[PDB]
């Protein structure tokens, strides 16, 4: 075989400790670049003028941050959605002042994670598997896209993309609530149903299978040793687990079919999170949460507050305080 | 939720953070386990819709743990190899997360908050050019408190004249 | 109109309150809208000169129809709630408005997303069906069982 | 920055004490007859 043929065989080999594959051919360098730039920036990058008003925000550890406060800071509002690679800067110092690391990292990362999804398809194909694990992964991926790419596009600036840091994430959330009332948006509510529900069903399934483990061990050893990797027999009694849960609620609320059950386990959080992503991605174009501000009115016309109006007051606090030196005109239109 | 952000800085609390890790991690495990089982199924029927090819009474695993293990080993670097451990872990993550969040709220009962980082405040008080996302979020909190307290806490009879309300430029 | 010299008016941050430079030097509108300087529109272009917004044109050449149009567009920005309350998320009920641009953009993002998902679904399935394992793994011929261990 | 001076040793013992617990248990597990 010729060199290219050999190379292809290696790339797509099912015997590599970590599968490479063609998606991996793109994934590996982009994820490495994103990772390296991220670590160096998080430790050592100078303050970044996120909002384009010459008010640099310090993100890195060496410049006064800890793990909780630190971040790689989004690129300058002056850049907006312009492409700002290293070679567009007059110098690395300019590049750093304007938040170049952020763009390098999120673009390399979004590409790399997309290829990660593709790679999940690819290995499933090489191993003779069914292909849809990658579809499950599309949910967290879509969310990543929502906060790093789509929301910036809609608002016209990567300065509004989610910061790469813990406190920065919280900042993104609070400003988001101010400007979109995301809590009153049904797609975010479906997202909450997705992750609360995912947690519920995770615990539920975990506990039901654990409850019906077939006795294979003594009391002085871990029950886990009762399962051996690759054994053909199922390790728990699903009829007993179903007897239990079916009696816990009523019989027809419970799954007797393991395939049906596991499909449910996949579908609930995945769909919920799909809607969370779509929530962010559509509030990106300012179609916002329900607004029931002053919706209840008495016979004279006095406003009768509901809990929605209290929410509105909180949001007002966030709105009037955020980016306190950036607005010169009365409406925050992006 | 918004009250806890504004008054307790609850997102800053490591017990809440552990809570979040447990809920999102629980969701992740739910998703990945369901999808993995569904995509390592043995062909146990002729149907293209594969749900019917299962019998609750059957002895055999309905999906391949060995294939699942190799797939995730080659994709993520590590993989479950033990089913019992897998399901116990699925119990452990979200249950523990919720327990931790509980501990945090018990703290917030006494206003025993993770509200501030003292070093941050000392630096920022002395140095008017020092800014982080932590100081940004405190400004947001201060807005929430001032703008929500009078209607949210009517028994206090708060009257905050316009001139004392914290506000950035224009807004 | 009130007497301000908008060309020399320094804003709180040090950048122009009304006018500033883009990163390549063009004169552009100040404030947050610095992000939107790539915008071009029939009502704004007559104020544009070779170096961007022209201070002389701004001072002497702005027509009433331009004021009108700017006011109209400022007050019909594509922001609004799911129940069609126009304005920022904190606005009170009164104006029944969500921009068609918002409706169209959001609808087609949702549809494009689910169609990407559909593509992954049906592509993966088509691969598996063509290769013949879309219904699951053959127990007596499980591919991984014929592969050398990873370690 | 004016950090808490006990933070360093607090973090160091927080990591080392239980890590060392685990390493001890692991090594003596490996050394048991196979």
């Amino acid at each position: 075989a010729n060199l290219w043929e050999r190379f292809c065989n290696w790339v797509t080999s099912t015997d590599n400790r970590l599968y490479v594959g063609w998606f991996g051919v793109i994934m590996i360098p982009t994820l490495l670049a994103a990772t390296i730039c991220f670590v160096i920036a998080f430790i050592a990058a100078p303050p970044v003028d996120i909002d384009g008003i010459r008010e640099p925000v310090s993100g890195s550890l060496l410049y006064g941050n800890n793990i909780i406060t630190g971040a790689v800071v989004p690129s300058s509002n002056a850049i907006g959605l312009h492409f700002y690679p290293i070679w567009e800067a007059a110098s690395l110092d300019e590049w750093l002042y304007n938040g170049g690391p952020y763009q390098l990292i999120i673009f390399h990362f979004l590409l790399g994670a997309s290829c990660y999804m593709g790679r999940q398809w690819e290995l499933s194909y090489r191993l003779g598997m069914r292909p849809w694990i990658c579809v499950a992964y599309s949910a967290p991926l879509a969310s990543a896209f929502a906060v790093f790419l789509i929301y910036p596009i809609g608002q016209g600036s990567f300065s509004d993309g989610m910061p790469l840091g813990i406190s920065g994430t919280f900042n993104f959330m609070i400003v988001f609530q101010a400007e979109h009332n995301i809590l009153m948006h049904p797609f975010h509510q479906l997202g909450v149903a997705g992750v609360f529900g995912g947690a519920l069903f995770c615990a539920m399934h975990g506990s039901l299978v654990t409850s019906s483990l077939i006795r294979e061990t003594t009391e002085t050893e871990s029950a886990n040793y009762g399962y051996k990797f690759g054994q053909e027999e199922e390790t728990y009694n699903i009829v007993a687990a179903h007897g239990y849960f079916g009696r816990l609620i009523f019989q027809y609320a419970s799954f007797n079919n393991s395939r049906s059950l596991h499909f449910f386990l996949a579908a609930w959080p995945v769909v919920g999170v799909w809607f969370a992503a779509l929530g962010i991605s559509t509030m990106a174009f300012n179609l916002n949460g329900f607004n029931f501000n002053h919706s209840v009115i008495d016979a004279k016309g006095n406003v009768i507050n509901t809990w929605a109006d209290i929410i509105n007051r909180a949001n007002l606090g966030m709105e009037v305080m955020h980016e306190r030196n950036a607005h010169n005109f009365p409406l925050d239109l992006a | 939720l918004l009250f806890f952000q504004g008054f307790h800085n609850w997102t800053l609390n490591p017990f809440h953070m552990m809570g979040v890790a447990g809920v999102l991690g629980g969701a992740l495990l739910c998703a990945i386990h369901g999808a993995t089982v569904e995509n390592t199924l043995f062909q146990d029927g002729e149907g293209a819709s594969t749900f019917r090819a299962f019998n609750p009474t059957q002895a055999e695993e309905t999906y391949s743990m060995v294939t699942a293990n190799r797939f995730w080993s080659q994709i993520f670097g590590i993989a479950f190899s033990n089913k019992r451990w897998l399901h116990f872990f699925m119990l452990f993550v979200p249950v523990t997360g919720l327990w931790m969040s509980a501990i945090g709220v018990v703290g917030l009962a006494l206003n025993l908050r993770s509200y501030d980082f003292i070093s941050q405040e000392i630096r920022a008080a002395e140095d008017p050019e020092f800014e982080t996302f932590y100081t940004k979020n405190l400004l947001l909190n201060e807005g929430i408190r001032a703008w929500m307290a009078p209607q949210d806490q009517p028994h206090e009879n708060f009257v905050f004249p316009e001139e004392v309300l914290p506000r950035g430029n224009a807004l | 109109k009130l007497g301000a010299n908008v060309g020399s008016a320094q804003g709180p941050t040090g950048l122009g309150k009304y006018l500033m430079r883009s990163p390549t030097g063009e004169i552009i509108f100040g404030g947050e809208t610095m992000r939107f300087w790539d915008f071009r529109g029939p009502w704004l272009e007559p104020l544009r000169g070779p170096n961007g917004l022209d201070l002389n044109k701004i001072k002497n050449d702005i027509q009433p129809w331009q004021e009108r149009r700017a006011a109209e567009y400022m007050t019909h920005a594509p922001l609004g709630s799911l129940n069609s309350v126009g304005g920022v998320a904190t606005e009170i009920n009164s104006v029944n408005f969500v921009s068609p641009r918002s409706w169209l953009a959001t609808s087609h993002f949702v549809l494009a997303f689910f169609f990407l998902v559909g593509h992954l679904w049906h592509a993966g399935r088509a691969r598996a069906a063509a290769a013949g394992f879309e219904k699951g793994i053959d127990r007596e011929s499980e591919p991984v069982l014929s592969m050398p261990s990873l370690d | 920055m004016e950090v808490n001076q006990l933070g360093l040793i607090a973090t160091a013992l927080f990591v080392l004490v239980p890590s060392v617990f685990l390493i001890i248990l692991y090594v003596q597990t490996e050394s048991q007859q196979k």
């Binding site: 430790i43 | 590590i78 | 261990s149 | 950090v3």
Partner: peptide, 30 residues
């Protein structure tokens, strides 16, 4: 010292990734 501590814990975690992956106990079929 703070920075050194943060980066040290992070570094130990990466090292741990390496051992957990390439020096894991190999899964064995029974």
């Amino acid at each position: 010292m703070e920075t050194i501590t943060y980066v040290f814990i992070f570094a130990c975690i990466i090292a741990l990734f390496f051992f957990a992956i390439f020096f894991r106990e190999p899964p064995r079929i029974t």
